[PDB]
Design a protein around this ligand. Structure first.
Ligand SMILES: [Zn+2]
Ligand SMILES: [Zn+2]
Lengths: 1336, 70, 98
DNA sequence: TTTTTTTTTTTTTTTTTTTTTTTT
DNA sequence: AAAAAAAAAAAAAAAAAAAAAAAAAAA
């Protein structure tokens, strides 16, 4: 088969080659005999016959006349399907411009001639003339002229002057260019020019011209001369039942075009006046514009139905276009759908299948088996027998169904666990019975949510659905290493009720001879389900070298746990089933079984757990009545206290003691406190209230009140969803998001009056609307993410590299949010981890860190691990397997072939439907400081003179547990290495004020300070001290504006005090609005304060992060290390110049004046230091801080957003999306290579080019990495078909055509469209073979 | 009757050579040229091939060896 | 409702609308990622090659299944040819170089 | 008085899955 | 009786990307 797809412009000769006959008339079919109208969009001698092996004239109507052409009518006697391929060609009487190559915003013709698009559209409208090589006499080549100017020029010159208008003039301009000479001249201009905007324009036009020259295209081909016509079948004219014809809009546009062309040719023949022929030419231009791409130039022309008709463009692009409706996914045979039910008797790997639907699906299989068995003489007899539904067909169907998996698939398949293959089990009825547990994976609830079943047909597909997609194989999610078979909401309640203890139940305290005796006692009713007893249990352990050893002991348990123990497999220990067994305990029991035994034991264990949980929940009869919501006895007392408090606060407001805001805050505070008290009283009276006796007075126990059982167990409940039943339901928010002063003090057990219920509808409608729009935004985000990752396929075993990120546990500022184990588990390291006792290493360089290695690390208490990350993988066209790590739903290293890009995209996108002072030390440890500059203050304490100081709590074990960021100028109560106790405020600072603390001591002298010009006169009347306030630039006189107020500290002798350590005198050039309090001749110490200068969403934030959109406040960083200074200020901005001590000085930056600064004109700041302050732009982080910095920032941000809502996403996926995000690079130096100076080239191409150049003696080029948003990181792709599906299609296809690009069908998308095998899954090897046979 | 393929992936690595090898073996068994090795017990060619792979009497190497013998 | 050999469309050879028209289900853009995430290639290949689109392949597998042979002859989707023709209707020339 | 940068303004894309009196 | 295209339509948010026009700010 073919290997690559080429796309390029169409020359008129090529269009002639495609076609098979010109169309000369608008007719379609005769109304009396609906047969092709000659020379009409439906012909017979041009676009093939209408009937198989039959001519239109009917002279030859036999197969034996194959290939002949009937003399009467000239029809080639062939198949009718040839009508699907033959094309025509319409010869325009005038050239017509192609709208795609005219009105695409980077208009190809617009910048080809360097002519403004307005002046081109004016020409196409016959509104003005244009010189066409008129000679260097009086007018220029590209000069435009109006009617009067053209007439004056014609009077001036009759000859040696050529001017025209319209498509003819544009085509002449295109034909008259010299691409090579123009390219050389423009390259010279680019070399000489310096203007950056002019530079970019010249490089863009150079790139266009060079692309044209390299490709076989010619500029004149842009202008349309010969118009191809789609084959008739693709625009059908079928007669609807009853003599009515259904036709597409391509026909209307083509008819319009042919009619206009006929009128134009007739007018030219008749020699009509200039105005009429010009009008007809313009109208033909508009008609062809509508046919090519309707609704772009002018307003879309409608039909008789008053709607914008669909043209070829609308058929290509759009969600209804061929790409996204008939290529990337199509309706599928051997398929069906229905509603679902529970069907708990099923095993984990078989779903029900209605008899009727199953019969319809597997019909060809039934026919094959029947004609094999001989019961059907012919296929028609078999069809009739199946249709009548004979009794023999059922045995055949049950024979076929035996081993033939069917793929169940829900409608929103967000992630790969939304298509799973079960083994059908025939069921009477019309419901697709589905195993209950898998609902958790599907998020399928039996409220009428429908499901589709597909049937794998081929042998390979059957084995695929048997070995990859089976439900029993997906016992572990792709996003995180936790199971996805957690017993969900009813099985869990059954186990919880069945694994419990009652202080005194029937038959408590006897001794049993094992689980069998316990079950036997329970069934007869002699001993209650849960009564404390002693049982002899044998538990097995595999501590030996794969050999199980048993140990028998007389454990103390309940009869319920004794019954449960018969289901747990051999290996697990008894202590797992010796507790309350809620939802976390049971899920962790499943996880322990999976990790200790394997897969099959855990599958059978899950099935048994489900069966027994259902059975014993049934035996419980766990109900819920109106006596199971015990409203607290002290609720009314709390509400009375709250009302008294709010009344007192209102009275205080009447006295004016409290302002409106303060009283509002106090009232909300008291209401929150009262609500919390009520909830606590509720829980105390609900969870422990049950009291019984056992040979004594009384004793308390965990209560069996049904709602407490359904809340504590985690089975469809929570402490939050309760307290709206018994205790008051708190406060409700208004549409603005505010919190209403008066909460609603009635729960659901007591009913809500009119106003309180009406208040409690803002929340409900806000939630419903948020969900309704969140599903849409999440779908869009998932599509973009998976179309940015739709190339990542693991093709290598190891890239052989050392680079990697440094993974460390994350600390928000307080306690650790996530330890090192969760983030590091199942990844390949980058260097030999070594214990704090660095005399020996800890782990090898390239060992997959499984559980044992992580536990060893925890024992040795390591802080950071240099781990290889996908962002750093050195492979091209993929990533090394060792770079990715553990497979996440396989317990081993990733498998060479898994399409990590798609699974990572789906993992990130699925949760989208689940989204929208001082310091206090907690633990006892030693203070540590990182990147800190500090000096002793006037009072003997320590003051930080650095910006990026980080405090850490190094416990006695040497591991950080707490981290803090300190602003500039903070007083430390203690010092580094000083052990401190919990609750100690080691440091404190003022949230307001910006200090200018100094570094020297001595008398204060008024240096470069002038009243009025630099400062004003003001006195703090509160204390009577005169303060020296610096005026702003917009107020101070220009005379003193050049002068910056400063404070040079000197001694009593007049000598200038020099900065400690350094030699420069200490001068602090104060900025505007600085309030110096201390006056002249005032002695000050080091660090004395001179001026106390005064001062998102869940899903949208993730969308912005992956789009890499510059935030509202683009906090600018230190572009280069060096001392700061101010240059020539301008009106709108300040000139900040950063000059290194020994580097290049000239760089400067314009900063808006209103922006707040953080450098006092003398702080030497290294590269990357935040100059402004605010949210960072990821592009800045990538450009300055490197590659690891931006990936770290993105990972941290997205993980914060996700963990905020309690969703886990292993960081590999975000890293993969990041690797795809920053994949392009812009050349800085061309070097010995052959790359343009500023051209933006894919990273892999430049990388391999540089590597293979360095293999030679030539010097490689320098590249600056670039970061592009997901949408733009997708639209700029090597292949054009892959980028032609998910985005603007007109732009992509136009760019591909003009560039003459060439796609090679290498990704996960182009192969999908073309129908060939996939280079990711089972087809991987095949593709490799296809590569190996080639070039061999 | 079969449930899982864990032993199969343990025998043949990559869980993708498994699918292809089982597919080819089942294809030989299905078209009426060849005969099975493991005693058929009412299963289908796919599950029989997976039984052969799991028990360890066939893999890509053995399959190619039996092919080149013929 | 389920379909196995219902009548196909005319413009792009594919199954028809659901239920009353006897059509299949939509293996949509979101249901092809669900397979690519797996190691599923052959199943996807058939799901968008011979189950819906390729004009002769579905008939060939029909006869094979009736003949007891489980295989395919994938060919190329007819909708891809439709897209090629529709792109060629514009002024852009597209072909399949080998 | 010309030229480059930066800013503004207009325009172009995207926005979930399935189920009728009048000329030839 | 077979065919056939004008209109005066007018209308939407929200958000963001990208190209074109306009205004500083010089030397
Ligand atoms: Zn004829
Ligand atoms: Zn690598």
């Amino acid at each position: 088969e073919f290997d690559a797809i080429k796309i390029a412009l169409a020359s008129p000769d090529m269009i002639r080659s495609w076609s098979f006959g010109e169309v000369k008339k608008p007719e379609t079919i005769n109304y009396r005999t609906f047969k092709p109208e000659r020379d009409g969009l439906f012909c017979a001698r041009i676009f093939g016959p209408v009937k198989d092996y039959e001519c239109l004239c009917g002279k030859y109507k036999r197969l034996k006349h194959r290939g002949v052409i009937c003399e009467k009518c000239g029809v080639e006697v062939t198949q009718t399907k040839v009508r699907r391929e033959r094309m025509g060609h319409i010869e325009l009487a005038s050239p017509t411009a192609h709208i795609w190559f005219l009105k695409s915003l980077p208009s190809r013709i617009g910048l080809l001639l360097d002519m403004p698009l307005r002046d081109i559209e004016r020409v196409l409208y016959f509104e003005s003339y244009v010189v066409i090589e008129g000679g260097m006499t009086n007018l220029e080549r590209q000069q435009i002229l109006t009617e009067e100017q053209y007439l004056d020029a014609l009077e001036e010159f009759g000859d040696e002057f050529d001017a025209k208008m319209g498509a003819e003039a544009i085509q002449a301009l295109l034909k008259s260019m010299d691409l090579e000479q123009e390219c050389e001249q423009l390259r010279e201009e680019l070399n000489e020019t310096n203007s950056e905007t002019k530079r970019k324009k010249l490089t863009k036009r150079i790139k266009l011209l060079e692309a044209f020259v390299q490709s076989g295209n010619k500029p004149e081909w842009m202008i349309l001369t010969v118009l191809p016509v789609l084959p008739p079948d693709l625009r059908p004219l079928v007669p609807l039942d009853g003599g009515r014809f259904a036709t597409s809009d391509l026909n209307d546009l083509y008819r319009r075009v042919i009619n206009r062309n006929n009128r134009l040719k007739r007018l030219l023949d008749l020699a009509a006046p200039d105005i009429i022929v010009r009008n007809e030419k313009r109208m033909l231009q508009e008609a062809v514009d509508a046919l090519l791409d309707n609704g772009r130039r002018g307003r879309a022309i409608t039909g008789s139905n008053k709607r914008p008709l669909k043209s070829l463009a609308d058929m290509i692009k759009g969600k209804q276009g061929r790409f996204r409706q008939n290529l990337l996914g199509k309706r599928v045979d051997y398929s069906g759908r229905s509603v679902i039910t529970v069907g708990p008797y099923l095993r984990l790997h078989q779903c029900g299948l209605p008899k009727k639907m199953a019969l319809e699906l597997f019909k060809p299989f039934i026919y094959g088996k029947l004609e094999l068995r001989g019961l059907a003489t012919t296929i028609k007899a078999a069809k009739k027998m199946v249709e009548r539904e004979e009794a023999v067909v059922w045995d055949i169907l049950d024979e076929v169904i035996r081993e033939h998996p069917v793929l169940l698939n829900r409608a929103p398949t967000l992630h790969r666990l939304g298509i799973q293959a079960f083994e059908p089990v025939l069921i009477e009825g019309k419901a697709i019975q589905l195993h209950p547990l898998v609902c958790a994976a599907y998020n399928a609830d039996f409220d009428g949510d429908q499901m589709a079943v597909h049937v794998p047909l081929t042998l390979e597909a059957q084995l695929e659905a048997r070995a990859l997609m089976m439900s029993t194989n997906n016992i572990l999610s792709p996003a995180n290493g936790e199971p996805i078979i957690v017993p969900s909401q009813d099985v869990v309640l059954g186990l919880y009720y069945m694994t419990r203890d009652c202080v005194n139940a029937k038959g408590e305290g006897m001794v049993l001879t094992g689980p069998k005796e316990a079950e036997r006692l329970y069934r007869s009713g002699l001993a209650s389900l849960h009564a404390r007893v002693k049982v002899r249990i044998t538990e097995y352990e595999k501590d030996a070298n794969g050999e199980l050893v048993a140990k028998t002991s007389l454990k103390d348990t309940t009869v319920g746990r004794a019954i449960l123990w018969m289901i747990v497999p051999k290996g697990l220990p008894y202590s797992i089933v010796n507790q309350a067994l809620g939802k976390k305990a049971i899920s962790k029991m499943l996880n322990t079984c999976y990790r200790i035994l394997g897969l099959k034991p855990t599958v059978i264990f899950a099935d048994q757990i489900m069966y027994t949980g259902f059975a014993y929940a049934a035996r419980s009869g766990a109900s819920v009545g109106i006596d199971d919501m015990v409203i607290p006895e002290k609720k009314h007392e709390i509400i009375s206290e709250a009302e008294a408090e709010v009344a007192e606060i209102q009275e205080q407001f009447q006295s004016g003691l409290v302002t409106a805001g303060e009283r509002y805050n106090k009232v909300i505070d008291i209401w929150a406190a009262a609500n919390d008290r009520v909830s606590k009283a509720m829980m105390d009276n609900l969870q422990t209230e049950t009291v019984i006796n056992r040979d004594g007075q009384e004793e308390k126990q965990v209560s069996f009140n049904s709602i407490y059982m359904m809340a504590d167990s985690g089975a469809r409940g929570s402490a939050a969803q309760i307290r709206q039943l018994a205790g008051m339901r708190g406060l409700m928010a208004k549409p603005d998001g505010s919190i209403i002063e008066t909460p609603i003090t009635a729960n659901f057990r007591e009913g809500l009056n009119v106003l309180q219920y009406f208040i409690s509808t803002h929340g409900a409608r806000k939630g419903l609307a948020d969900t309704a729009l969140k599903t849409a935004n999440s779908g869009y985000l998932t599509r973009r993410l998976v179309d940015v990752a739709q190339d990542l396929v693991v093709t290598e075993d190891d890239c052989g590299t050392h680079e990697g990120i440094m993974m460390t546990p994350v600390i928000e500022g307080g306690d650790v949010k996530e330890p090192l184990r969760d983030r590091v588990l199942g990844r390949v390291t980058a260097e030999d981890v070594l214990k704090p006792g660095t005399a020996d290493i800890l782990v090898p360089r390239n060992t997959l860190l499984h559980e044992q290695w992580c536990d060893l690390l925890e024992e040795n208490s390591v802080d950071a691990v240099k781990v290889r990350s996908v962002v750093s993988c050195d492979t091209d066209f993929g990533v090394c397997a060792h770079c990715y790590g553990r497979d996440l739903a396989r317990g081993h290293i990733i498998n060479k072939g898994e399409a990590i890009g798609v699974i990572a995209a789906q993992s990130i996108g699925e949760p989208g439907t689940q989204l929208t002072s001082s310091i206090q030390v907690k633990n006892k440890g030693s203070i540590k400081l990182s990147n800190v500059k500090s000096v002793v203050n006037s009072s003997g304490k320590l003051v930080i003179t650095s910006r990026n100081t980080e405090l850490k709590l190094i416990d006695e074990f040497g591991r950080t547990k707490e981290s803090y960021k300190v602003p500039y100028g903070a007083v430390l109560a203690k010092g580094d290495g000083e052990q401190v106790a919990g609750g100690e405020t080691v440091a404190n600072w003022d949230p307001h004020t910006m200090p200018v603390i100094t570094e020297v001591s001595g008398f204060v002298r008024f240096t470069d300070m002038i009243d009025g010009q630099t400062i004003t006169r003001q006195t703090d009347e509160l204390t009577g001290l005169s303060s020296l306030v610096v005026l702003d630039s917009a107020e101070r006189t220009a005379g003193g504006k050049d002068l910056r107020p400063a404070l040079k500290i000197v001694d009593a002798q007049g000598n200038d005090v020099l900065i400690p350590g350094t030699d420069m005198p200490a001068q602090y050039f104060l900025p505007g609005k600085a309030i110096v309090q201390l006056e002249d001749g005032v002695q000050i110490s080091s660090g004395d304060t001179l001026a106390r200068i005064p001062q998102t969403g869940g899903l949208p934030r993730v969308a912005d992060l992956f789009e890499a959109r510059r935030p509202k406040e683009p906090a600018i960083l230190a572009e280069i290390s060096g001392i700061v200074s101010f240059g020539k200020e301008t009106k709108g901005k300040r000139r900040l110049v950063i000059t290194p001590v020994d580097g290049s000085d000239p760089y400067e930056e314009m900063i808006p004046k209103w922006r707040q600064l953080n450098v006092f004109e003398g702080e030497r700041v290294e590269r990357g230091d935040v100059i402004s302050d605010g949210p960072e732009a990821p592009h800045d982080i990538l450009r300055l801080r490197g590659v690891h910095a931006v990936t770290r920032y993105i990972v941290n941000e997205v993980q914060d957003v996700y963990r905020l809502q309690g969703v886990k996403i292993n960081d590999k996926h975000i890293e993969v999306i990041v690797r795809q995000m920053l994949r392009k690079a812009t050349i800085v130096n061309a070097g010995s290579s052959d790359f343009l100076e500023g051209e933006q080239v894919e990273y892999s191409r430049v990388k391999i080019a540089n590597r293979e150049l360095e293999a030679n003696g030539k010097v490689g080029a320098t590249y600056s990495r670039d970061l592009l948003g997901i949408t733009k990181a997708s639209l700029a792709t090597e292949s054009f078909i892959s980028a032609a599906s998910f985005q603007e299609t007109t732009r992509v296809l136009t760019e591909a055509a003009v560039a003459g690009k060439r796609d090679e069908l290498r990704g996960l998308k182009e192969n999908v469209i073309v129908g060939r095998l996939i280079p990711a899954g089972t087809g991987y090897a095949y593709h490799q073979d296809r590569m190996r046979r080639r070039a061999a | 009757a079969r449930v899982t393929v864990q032993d199969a992936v343990e025998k043949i690595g990559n869980r993708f050579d498994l699918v292809l090898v089982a597919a080819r073996r089942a294809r030989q068994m299905q078209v009426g040229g060849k005969d099975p090795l493991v005693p058929e017990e009412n299963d289908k060619t796919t599950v029989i091939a997976l039984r052969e792979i799991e028990e360890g009497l066939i893999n890509n190497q053995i399959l190619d060896v039996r092919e080149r013998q013929e | 409702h389920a379909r196995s050999t219902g009548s196909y469309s005319l413009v792009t050879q594919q199954p028809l609308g659901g239920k009353a028209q006897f059509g299949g289900q939509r293996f949509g853009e979101m249901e092809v990622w669900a397979l690519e995430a797996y190691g599923a290639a052959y199943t996807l290949q058939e799901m968008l090659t011979v189950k819906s689109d390729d004009v002769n392949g579905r008939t060939k597998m029909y006869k094979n299944i009736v003949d007891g042979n489980h295989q395919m002859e994938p060919g190329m989707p007819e909708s891809f040819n439709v897209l090629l023709k529709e792109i060629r209707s514009l002024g852009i020339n597209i072909e399949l170089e080998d």
